[PDB]
């Protein structure tokens, strides 16, 4: 319904959950450091990189297992809207932007396990074919 959807959609906003990985390590360059993030975290590959007002907008990419680089399909989200939610696999992440080039590392491996069936993007909501 109109109101059925609504309630649900809110449910869907909040799903940056599961047991997160708390530690991301980053690089550190005197140029990088400056325009660094606020908080960057993950539970999945669905990773959030929040930004301060006064922190530039990098462009970040993922390092697939190939080791070679790739570009993630990302988006930013938030009331803050600053954060960039990326929806592609990768441990590391580069965070280029012209000369400069950071590269936060994600740091978790529960290997060989993790897969389930979300059943949408975020598990809150669901797909009930039409």
């Amino acid at each position: 319904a109109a109101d059925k959807k609504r309630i649900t959609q809110k449910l869907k906003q909040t799903a940056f959950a599961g047991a997160k990985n708390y530690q991301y390590v980053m690089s550190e360059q005197p140029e990088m450091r400056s325009i660094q993030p606020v908080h960057v975290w993950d539970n999945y590959r669905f990773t959030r990189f929040e930004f301060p007002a006064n922190a530039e907008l990098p462009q970040v990419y993922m390092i697939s297992a190939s080791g070679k680089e790739t570009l993630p399909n990302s988006h930013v989200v938030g009331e803050n809207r600053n954060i960039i939610e990326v929806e592609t696999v990768a441990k590391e992440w580069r965070i280029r932007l012209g000369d400069k080039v950071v590269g936060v590392r994600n740091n978790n491996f529960a290997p060989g396990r993790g897969a389930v069936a979300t059943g949408t993007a975020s598990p809150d909501v669901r797909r009930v074919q039409i």
Binding site: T14, K20, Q23, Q29, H39, V40, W41, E69, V77, N80
Partner: peptide, 28 residues
Amino acid sequence: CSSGHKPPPEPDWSNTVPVNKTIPVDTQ
């Protein structure tokens, strides 16, 4: 012959400080 691509600008691997500052909350 030809040239290839130049391997990527590689970030500091040596220095490594943690990302996060305070602890994250959900915004959205």
